[PDB]
Amino acid sequence: TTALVCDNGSGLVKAGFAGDDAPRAVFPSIVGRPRHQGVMVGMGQKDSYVGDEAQSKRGILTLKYPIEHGIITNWDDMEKIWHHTFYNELRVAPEEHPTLLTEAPLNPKANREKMTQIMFETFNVPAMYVAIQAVLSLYASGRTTGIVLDSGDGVTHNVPIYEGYALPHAIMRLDLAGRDLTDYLMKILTERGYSFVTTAEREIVRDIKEKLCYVALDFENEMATAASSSSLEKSYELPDGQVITIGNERFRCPETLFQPSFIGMESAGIHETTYNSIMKCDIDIRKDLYANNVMSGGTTMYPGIADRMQKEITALAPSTMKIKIIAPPERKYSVWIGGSILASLSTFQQMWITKQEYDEAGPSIVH
Amino acid sequence: TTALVCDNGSGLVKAGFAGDDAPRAVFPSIVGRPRHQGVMVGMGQKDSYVGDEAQSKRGILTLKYPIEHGIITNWDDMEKIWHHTFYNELRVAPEEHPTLLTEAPLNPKANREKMTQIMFETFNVPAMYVAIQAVLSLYASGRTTGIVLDSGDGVTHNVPIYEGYALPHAIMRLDLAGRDLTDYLMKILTERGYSFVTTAEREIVRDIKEKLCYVALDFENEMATAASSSSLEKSYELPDGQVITIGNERFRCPETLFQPSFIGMESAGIHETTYNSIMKCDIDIRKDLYANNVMSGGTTMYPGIADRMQKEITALAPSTMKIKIIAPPERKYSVWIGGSILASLSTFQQMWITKQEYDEAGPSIVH
Ligand SMILES: Nc1ncnc2c1ncn2[C@@H]1O[C@H](COP(=O)(O)OP(=O)(O)O)[C@@H](O)[C@H]1O
Numbered sequence: 058t059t060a061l062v063c064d065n066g067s068g069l070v071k072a073g074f075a076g077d078d079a080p081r082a083v084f085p086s087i088v089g090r091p092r093h094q095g096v097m098v099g100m101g102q103k104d105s106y107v108g109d110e111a112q113s114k115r116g117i118l119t120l121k122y123p124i125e126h127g128i129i130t131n132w133d134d135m136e137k138i139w140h141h142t143f144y145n146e147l148r149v150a151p152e153e154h155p156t157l158l159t160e161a162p163l164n165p166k167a168n169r170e171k172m173t174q175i176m177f178e179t180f181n182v183p184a185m186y187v188a189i190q191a192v193l194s195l196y197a198s199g200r201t202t203g204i205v206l207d208s209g210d211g212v213t214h215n216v217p218i219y220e221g222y223a224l225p226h227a228i229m230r231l232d233l234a235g236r237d238l239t240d241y242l243m244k245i246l247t248e249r250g251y252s253f254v255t256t257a258e259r260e261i262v263r264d265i266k267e268k269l270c271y272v273a274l275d276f277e278n279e280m281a282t283a284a285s286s287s288s289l290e291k292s293y294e295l296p297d298g299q300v301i302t303i304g305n306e307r308f309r310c311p312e313t314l315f316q317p318s319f320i321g322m323e324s325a326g327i328h329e330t331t332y333n334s335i336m337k338c339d340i341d342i343r344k345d346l347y348a349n350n351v352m353s354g355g356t357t358m359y360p361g362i363a364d365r366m367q368k369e370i371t372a373l374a375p376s377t378m379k380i381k382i383i384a385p386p387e388r389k390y391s392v393w394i395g396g397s398i399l400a401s402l403s404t405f406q407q408m409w410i411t412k413q414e415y416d417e418a419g420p421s422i423v424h
Numbered sequence: 425t426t427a428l429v430c431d432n433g434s435g436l437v438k439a440g441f442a443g444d445d446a447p448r449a450v451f452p453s454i455v456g457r458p459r460h461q462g463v464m465v466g467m468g469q470k471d472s473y474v475g476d477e478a479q480s481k482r483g484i485l486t487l488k489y490p491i492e493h494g495i496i497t498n499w500d501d502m503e504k505i506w507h508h509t510f511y512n513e514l515r516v517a518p519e520e521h522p523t524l525l526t527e528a529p530l531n532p533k534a535n536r537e538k539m540t541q542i543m544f545e546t547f548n549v550p551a552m553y554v555a556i557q558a559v560l561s562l563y564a565s566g567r568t569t570g571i572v573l574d575s576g577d578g579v580t581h582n583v584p585i586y587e588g589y590a591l592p593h594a595i596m597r598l599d600l601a602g603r604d605l606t607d608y609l610m611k612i613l614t615e616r617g618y619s620f621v622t623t624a625e626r627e628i629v630r631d632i633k634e635k636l637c638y639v640a641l642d643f644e645n646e647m648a649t650a651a652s653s654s655s656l657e658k659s660y661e662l663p664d665g666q667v668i669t670i671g672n673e674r675f676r677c678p679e680t681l682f683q684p685s686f687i688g689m690e691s692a693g694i695h696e697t698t699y700n701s702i703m704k705c706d707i708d709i710r711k712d713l714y715a716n717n718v719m720s721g722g723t724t725m726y727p728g729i730a731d732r733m734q735k736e737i738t739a740l741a742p743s744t745m746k747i748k749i750i751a752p753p754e755r756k757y758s759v760w761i762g763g764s765i766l767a768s769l770s771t772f773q774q775m776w777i778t779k780q781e782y783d784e785a786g787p788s789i790v791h
């Protein structure tokens with residue numbers, strides 16, 4: 058039989074059967090209602106378009122992201138996410154395969170029960186396991202020690218794990234990135250005349266957040282060469298034909314990740330949450346959290362990541378401490394390659410959630 | 425029995441049975457009373473002459489177009505238009521056929537109501553639907569996206585539709601074309617000494633507006649070769665036997681369509697109403713409003729369009745944006761071939777206004 062690794066990604070939900078190297082389906086999670094008068098006869102339309110189709114029919118719909126600060130807004134849209142994914146993307150019956158689901162490292166209750174229960178009664182899954190996204194990135198990297206940085210649009214997390222136990226008193230949740238980085242980029246993109254106010258227009262901002270934005274080596278010195286008239290500015294092209302040229306704001310927006318003063322929020326940067334979680338761990342283990350710092354999520358692919366984070370930590374940490382930050386190719390699919398490695402392993406398969414146990418004990422013993 | 429497609433044109437009402445060729449009866453809406461005393465007695469002639477006998481017996485009558493600025497002058501003449509077409513052209517019973525009527529995109533309330541209500545109570549049709557004249561040209565052209573140009577004597581319109589929704593905030597109505605081009609032609613025909621002024625006499629001007637006039641490619645450069653002593657004159661023959669030679673004024677009159685300062689009205693050319701409506705639409709859709717510009721109506725049958733319109737848009741439009749214009753053969757009957765395609769389709773017959781529903785709720789829910 059076949060098993061399915063399905064990641065409830067922040068962006069960028071990822072789905073694909075076990076092995077060999079990639080998700081079969083990746084999509085930007087948006088659901089979109091029709092916001093204008095439909096005058097055509099027929100009409101040949103869907104009641105609501107999900108992604109990909111909601112990313113090829115922008116501006117005639119009203120985009121609704123179904124996950125907001127790590128909570129899924131309603132299961133009415135969520136069941137349609139699931140159904141769409143299984144039937145017209147993966148092309149599989151849920152009863153066919155035991156599944157693998159992902160969750161958040163720090164989340165409220167009740168969100169793992171309600172998921173497990175609704176998916177068991179609605180889609181009639183035969184067995185299930187639900188993993189937090191951070192744990193899976195250890196399997197992908199081949200590590201069993203380290204602080205895990207799982208960063209997606211828009212909840213990041215900072216989890217310390219040591220061979221092979223979790224440190225409860227050192228776990229930090231930042232709501233700092235990344236949809237708020239999108240929202241900030243749109244707010245400092247107003248300075249260059251072309252505005253992108255609406256929900257639909259925000260997706261275009263995300264494409265300029267991917268490609269053109271970059272993290273610097275040091276803020277003060279990038280501000281210095283920005284003052285120079287020699288152009289380091291980059292020209293983006295807009296679907297109507299227009300060319301938008303951004304320069305200084307290009308490195309100002311991502312710098313927010315190490316300087317939350319741009320949002321003005323009271324929370325501290327990835328720099329300091331790394332230090333403050335390490336300096337709340339036991340003395341012996343602090344040695345091996347340094348050099349096993351493991352990054353993940355699509356948002357960590359910027360040029361100055363990890364060597365900004367490195368240079369800043371090496372300055373605050375004691376003299377001659379060995380610090381190297383683990384940055385593998387294609388981090389956006391790291392989590393999925395984790396799940397892929399995990400569910401194939403012998404043998405405590407007999408620690409999963411299964412229909413027979415669910416029949417007697419329901420959605421209890423899930424945390 | 426079989427549905428009847430009758431389009432309440434701007435000009436130029438068109439009427440014809442369900443498909444597939446062209447309307448059975450077309451006439452330019454004129455009613456005309458006899459303006460001189462009767463002396464032969466009896467006398468075998470009507471109280472007011474309808475077409476086509478009112479276009480042969482010109483000069484003994486006072487011609488009155490009943491559709492003025494898109495408003496119908498009174499239902500006394502309108503009911504007579506209807507009665508004359510159904511009885512004395514088509515030879516059809518209104519009680520027998522579900523009918524299909526058209527109206528304008530932006531026009532005053534309650535002129536679609538009062539029309540629908542009078543046609544149900546006077547002619548006792550069994551079912552009816554009222555379509556805006558522009559939407560039907562999409563079905564005829566075989567597309568479902570684009571800005572629709574329905575241009576007739578005396579009201580043109582600019583409606584943007586995107587697969588298959590309509591933008592309420594982007595609809596532009598010009599009262600500029602075509603009867604004011606007729607009036608301008610009549611004022612510059614005085615320039616060659618022919619004093620043409622009367623209501624009847626205006627019709628002959630309309631025929632010279634069709635055949636002899638031509639749209640240029642660049643005004644200043646068409647004026648340049650006009651400035652050479654060599655002829656630009658074309659010779660028209662007039663019913664009394666006279667030969668009229670127009671040349672210079674020949675390209676001056678149609679140019680009014682892109683140069684409305686010739687009339688002196690504050691409104692801007694089809695060029696600029698296209699651009700200003702497209703750049704009032706949301707960013708993503710703007711790409712496909714370009715290159716799916718769809719022309720229609722008899723007044724667009726000048727050979728110098730669409731490449732005047734093309735060259736003008738290409739001058740204002742951003743670089744690298746493709747511009748193509750959808751312009752079929754026989755554009756005057758585009759709308760009618762639309763109506764034929766529409767009313768023949770299943771299953772939207774149960775979205776028509778039917779006699780039972782009209783009896784139940786009167787002239788409500790028409791829009
Ligand atoms: N090259 C890139 N540079 C910066 N951000 C990127 C890049 N590619 C993708 N992203 C970001 O990755 C985000 C998706 O995060 P995701 O990987 O889904 O997080 P997670 O798996 O933890 O939920 C997107 O919202 C997008 O902005």
Ligand SMILES: Nc1ncnc2c1ncn2[C@@H]1O[C@H](COP(=O)(O)OP(=O)(O)O)[C@@H](O)[C@H]1O
Nearest residue numbers: 433434435436575576577634721722723725756
């Ligand atoms: N070859 C032509 N060149 C220019 N004008 C034309 C030509 N053929 C017809 N027309 C014009 O078309 C007008 C009718 O427009 P029409 O298409 O009937 O308006 P509508 O679309 O709103 O019903 C007439 O008044 C006539 O002057």
Ligand SMILES: [Mg+2]
Nearest residue numbers: 190207208209
């Ligand atoms: Mg994550």
Ligand SMILES: [Mg+2]
Nearest residue numbers: 574575576721
């Ligand atoms: Mg028309």
